[PDB]
A paper describes a structure:
Ribulose-1,5-bisphosphate carboxylase/oxygenase (RuBisCO) catalyses the addition of CO2 to ribulose 1,5-biphosphate (RuBP), using magnesium as a cofactor, once the enzyme has been activated by the addition of CO2 to a conserved active-site lysine residue to form a carbamate. In plants and cyanobacteria, RuBisCO forms a complex hexadecameric oligomer consisting of eight copies of the large (RbcL) subunit and eight copies of the small (RbcS) subunit. The active site of the enzyme is located at the interface between two RbcL subunits and contains a high concentration of conserved positively and negatively charged residues within a 10 Å radius of the catalytic residue. Lys201L is activated by the addition of CO2 and the labile carbamate form of this residue coordinates an Mg2+ ion that participates in catalytic activity.
Residue numbers in the entry:
A (entry chain V), B (entry chain S): 1 to 123
C (entry chain O), D (entry chain L): 20 to 332, 338 to 463
Amino acid sequence: MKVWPTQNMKRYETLSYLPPLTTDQLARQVDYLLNNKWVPCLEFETDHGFVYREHHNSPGYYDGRYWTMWKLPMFGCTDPAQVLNELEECKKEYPNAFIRIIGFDSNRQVQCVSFIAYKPAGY
Amino acid sequence: MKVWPTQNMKRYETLSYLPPLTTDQLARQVDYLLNNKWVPCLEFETDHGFVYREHHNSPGYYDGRYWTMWKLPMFGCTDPAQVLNELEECKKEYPNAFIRIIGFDSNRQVQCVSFIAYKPAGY
Amino acid sequence: YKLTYYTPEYETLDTDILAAFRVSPQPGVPPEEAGAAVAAESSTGTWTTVWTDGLTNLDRYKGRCYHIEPVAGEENQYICYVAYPLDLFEEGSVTNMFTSIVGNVFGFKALRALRLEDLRIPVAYVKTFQGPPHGIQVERDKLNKYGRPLLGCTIKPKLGLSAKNYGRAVYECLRGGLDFTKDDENVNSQPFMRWRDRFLFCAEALYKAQAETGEIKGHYLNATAGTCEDMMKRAVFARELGVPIVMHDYLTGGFTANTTLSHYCRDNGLLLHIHRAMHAVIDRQKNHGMHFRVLAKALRLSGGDHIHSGTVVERDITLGFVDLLRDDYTEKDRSRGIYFTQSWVSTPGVLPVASGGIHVWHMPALTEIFGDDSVLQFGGGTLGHPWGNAPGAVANRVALEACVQARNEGRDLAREGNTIIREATKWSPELAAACEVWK
Amino acid sequence: YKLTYYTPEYETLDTDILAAFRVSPQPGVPPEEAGAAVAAESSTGTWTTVWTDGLTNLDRYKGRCYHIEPVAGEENQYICYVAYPLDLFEEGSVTNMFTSIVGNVFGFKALRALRLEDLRIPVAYVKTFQGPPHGIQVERDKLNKYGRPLLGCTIKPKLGLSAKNYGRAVYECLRGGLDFTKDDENVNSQPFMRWRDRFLFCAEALYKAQAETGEIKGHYLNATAGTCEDMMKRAVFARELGVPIVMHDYLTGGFTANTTLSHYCRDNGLLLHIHRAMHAVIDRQKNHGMHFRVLAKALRLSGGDHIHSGTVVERDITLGFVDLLRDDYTEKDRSRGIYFTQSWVSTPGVLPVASGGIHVWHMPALTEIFGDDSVLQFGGGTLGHPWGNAPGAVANRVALEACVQARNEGRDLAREGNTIIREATKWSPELAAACEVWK
Ligand SMILES: [Mg+2]
Ligand SMILES: [Mg+2]
């Protein structure tokens, strides 16, 4: 009988309860985006990688949902490697950042994907 | 394609997106005040340097807009060097302070200028 | 009744409400008369003619039976199609729509039985309703939850816990990676747990679990009440606590109270979870009542963000009405019990909620069937875990993410579902423990 | 008509409203008759005489054509000057001022066309209006923004983004050094983006960008609505979010709703951005309608903090009405289309907003022409930067500060503007990238 831990157990939504994605597993999740004609984008955050409430308190208001866009969404990306290259460039500039891959469906007109690609050490 | 940084990128309003002003550049900005018959003054802050909200959060209420006056407005100042001398005296007493030059238009009856003259190292 | 109300040559207008009735006439009532009777008795038909009829044009206000087809297999049963003009209906009132169509006809003595299967709600009527307070896209954006089913748990036992003990179970549920916990449909305000106490303790628990995990959490706070005043007091305190989601039992509270709550929720940024308690009284029997798809359509107009859509342990019929809840446009398809092409002119979709008797081994099937825009609700399957609520929750969250990952890689969840779960047991002890207990 | 209403000897009172009309008479209608007809038909002129006229003194209530001058160049066109007594007008009601002066006369058959060019609003009428909720000086003090133009960006596309994706663009715009982002005049509440959703996500984005940069940020939240009740619910939520600035489409909403919102904004500390959507229906043609300067003066009375004043790609006419919006006193100047000396007796000035197809190379010209007390609004010129919104924003902020610095040092923005930008490209890669794309 294990007790689920309380300390240093922050999560990042979809896929963050699995083992960290290998470079191959990451490439297969990016392939799923490209096969559905979703536009991959990267987002990063240095300060708080979780949700909190500083500026307001009313229903459905949270701070910490928007992270910062790395460059632009990768329109007409054909190859997972182009995403994984930007991931490496982002990790190089911000080794202390959380980084997630997001996806835009231009047909449904929404953001449709969000999963963690890199966490700093200790997380 | 460069990504604009998120971290340690606080700004101080007018002129703070330019390179830090040289002594000569500072003197020319003070000359503009004097040529328009605006009264230069110095203002400094040791604690925050940015706007925040502690005491209230209603529309148009922010903390951190007022800094502290260095001495008095320099009425009947004719020479930029006198302002630059006060700047040096202020930096000597508060090396850890942000320091801006402000201007008062006694005809329009408002503050009319506010630009950063000195930041401590790391900013 | 024959000559006025059976109009096989009638071309339906784009403004007409269309109804498909499953009609079981009394022996020796021919279909044409049965169909005319349904139209007449759901609109302008009187038993004796009246002089006041000459003060208007009844042809403008009559229901018209415009098509009849026999039902395969069943003896003496027909689908009758009836057109009702737009002008019959109060704008934005589901109450009036149901009163007009189903208020009178189901007691008519020439019918042995009568079931409403479907309604074509015309786009000019659709635009009179608010619809969902938020709907699927906005909900995902507010909660910051993409690319998977959402995960919920009903707190059990439904009655008998103190408000504090109930909140303890909520915290332990939420912290293990469930998005939502939930009041049972029965939990309103009762002697051993008064609603305001429950709300307060559930708020403490939900905020503790959110601060622990960093993921946004909700608890479906049941605002269902005896009066509109009571319902509103409950929704208002939820607003005051800053919590994201409330709940209503739309059939037992009713459409008048539901539409009031839906408008309040839009105005105050609250998600609305809708429970379909009592649906089986109406929707179970094939020859008498109203199919759930009609109740679902009605809810999408009155408004809610989530609606209970049942377990899947016919599939096609469920997938039929799930599309009716989620999509902007659904084409007639008799194999899925969609009698009419339905447009929603950008009325938001509603999240279907799967519930009842499900556990970790159901997760591949549920993910395959519903897809990402669903809520999967695990009462027993979380609280029955041998290690308690947080491990319960972890087991469900891992099984789900394992399925999502496998699906995204190109695996067939229908064929390899068992294998996907088994693989995840190898690195999740919480899921391994669950998989020993069920199946 | 001639002897009562054409009064060339009349000395204007300090309480009179004076109008300058550009009058295009029907062929063979002499000017003096045209002028009298304009006066008569905008005041007390009756087609048959009536006994009730003897119960009062109509000389007290008549409009008087007191001067006529030909227009140089035009055949058969005149400026007619008309005096209206103070007693005609409801206090504090721009609605009544426009109704009284322009409500009737523009349809008069002896005129082929009619344009209102200017109004002298007397100081006693000025003091009946609140005027801007804050105005230029107060806005600068609240926002802590001195000694340069303010900078904004309209979010594009206007329709099609989800509320979250729209807020994403706002964050990325604001964080790169823009002061303001903005709702398009068309964005009120629509199926894919309901107003309260947009407000909420814009709040999150605005506060993220302010915390990141340490500068005060604003997003013009468009409160324009179908009813006053709806408009107010929107301004109220802006108040609740603590955000600095709302917007109104003052011509399509109208003056009655505008003045309500202006008073609410003064009472709750909200800045008010005013969009002039529909102005060109009225103000475009030289022969017929009302010059923008009249619409501008009206807005300064009803009240707003900002008003769209157009692109500047005649300059003198624009500079004319910009002074009318900002200054306390403007002397008659026919070369700038200022037909009357106007005093404002300390009614605050309104910030003019320049917009349209502008980009970094426009910055020297815009800074030269408008000076510091202006808002420069990019849409394409920020969002179209090859590196995205934040670099877009940085390019614009650097270009502006570079120009401000150069101007303060004594450089001529008219002559050296191109060179000032080129110099800044040497140390700003963000600006260098912009300068390759435009020009
Ligand atoms: Mg239940
Ligand atoms: Mg626009």
